[PDB]
């Protein structure tokens, strides 16, 4: 029976700038969605989940809670304006006008989707034409591509030579924002957080600190989001400079590389 518990997380105390993507002012349109990369920081998702000003907070791969117990290598953040009736469209396995033509969320997307109303900040009297959406596109989009080209369309057998008219339309048109319409036409801010994991040292992790390690005892351990129970001892095996954890045959973790020291420890099942 285990006696103590040990945890070991990196020596980093840099707060992650999550407010820059949320609290900024000028945000791009849908078919030119911005992308931000996040790494080498510590983040607290409890305050993000407990905001009380969040119309839609839906996400997959991880539970809304418990998320402070995981470590990832990178974080990607995207943001765009979507009309009220089409917030549902930003979700895996959905077919629609904007998702299929402007930005399609991959099916295996392990991450979170946030959407909230900002009608008091972007609605303009007389028509806000600053935000625009692509309406007319020729081909479907594979996950995670950005299209910027605005070449004229040829929807018929007669080329228009770059002149709008019959069988030739401008793919880009204005939203037509007005605070006097119904709920469906109202805008909503949409932000997508993506996650990834590879065989490389973790960069962005969760809160809570580490403790001193012990050996030659049956102890419950948690190394960088990997939980187990056993006896930690000293061993000797080849470890490539970047590979983190190595496993013995039959998918049993045999050796782990301790962060903050680059030491190699061996796990033996206590009996």
């Amino acid at each position, epitope marked *: 029976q285990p006696t103590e518990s040990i945890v070991r997380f990196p020596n980093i105390t840099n707060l992650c700038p999550f407010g820059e993507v949320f609290n900024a002012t000028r945000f791009a349109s849908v078919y030119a969605w911005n992308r931000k990369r996040i790494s080498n920081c510590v983040a607290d998702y409890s305050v993000l989940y407990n905001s009380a000003s969040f119309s839609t907070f839906k996400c997959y791969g991880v539970s809304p809670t418990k998320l402070n117990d995981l470590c990832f290598t990178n974080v990607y953040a995207d943001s765009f304006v979507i009309r009220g009736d089409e917030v549902r469209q930003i979700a895996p396995g959905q077919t629609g006008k904007i998702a299929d033509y402007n930005y399609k969320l991959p099916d295996d997307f392990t991450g979170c989707v946030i959407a909230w109303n900002s009608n008091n900040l972007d609605s303009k009297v007389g028509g806000n034409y600053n935000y625009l959406y692509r309406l007319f596109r020729k081909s479907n989009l594979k996950p995670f591509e950005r299209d910027i080209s605005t070449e004229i369309y040829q929807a018929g057998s007669t080329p228009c030579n770059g002149v709008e008219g019959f069988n030739c339309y401008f793919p880009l048109q204005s939203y037509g924002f007005q605070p006097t319409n119904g709920v469906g036409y109202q805008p909503y801010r949409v932000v997508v957080l993506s996650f990834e994991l590879l065989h490389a*040292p973790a960069t962005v992790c969760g809160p809570k600190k580490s403790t001193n390690l012990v050996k030659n005892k049956c102890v419950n351990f948690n190394f960088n989001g990997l939980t187990g129970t056993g006896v930690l001892t000293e061993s000797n095996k*080849k470890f490539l*400079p970047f590979q983190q954890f190595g496993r013995d045959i039959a998918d049993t973790t045999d050796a782990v590389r301790d962060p*903050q020291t*680059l030491e190699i420890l061996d796990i033996t099942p206590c009996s």
Partner: antibody
Amino acid sequence: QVQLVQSGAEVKKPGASVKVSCKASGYTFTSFYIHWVRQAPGQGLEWMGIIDPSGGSTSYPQKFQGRVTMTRDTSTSTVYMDLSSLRSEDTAVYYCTRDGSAGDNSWFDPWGQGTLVTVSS
Amino acid sequence: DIVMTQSPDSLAVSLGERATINCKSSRNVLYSSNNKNYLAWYQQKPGQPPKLLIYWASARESGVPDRFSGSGSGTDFTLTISSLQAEDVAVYYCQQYYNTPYTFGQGTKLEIKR
């Protein structure tokens, strides 16, 4: 061919930062690793980091964990060794080497010329 | 990490005689499934970056003469220079590459007896 060249010597007051560039030429820049070593005047060699192109770790020993920062660049094919919080015991010569022959291997074959860094008041 | 101890610290050898420098380790640095040691012997002259001289502990790079050799296994290794000339005065280091520490040696200067 298969050569690395660095910048010139620097002398700075304590508390400032240091940036050193290791320009590479001759091989495929994104197929080998690169390490940085330092040499105190009259002492033995040391080891202070590792980095690989195409994205990857920047691993340090215990005493260099929260001080050194080693960035990466492509196209220009350069590496950087941003170092902060200088002290009086940092006056040394810095070399940048690569791995060679892949796998788990060190073989620091093509050393650079190394730059001299002095910290004084 | 691995603590590598190299002795003797300094030595003086006449022209045309043997010379041996020993580099010990702290943990066994061989590897089953491959049977390959993991060591490297360098050489540094003043105002010059160190240049690789011996690798794998039993092989030499191209261009190095036959006067330099290398033998050993397990924990202790040796150089055994064959013939000493006037241009072989430098500082020698030993380094291992099986663990993250990348530990090296201490340095053994050479002189000429007279």
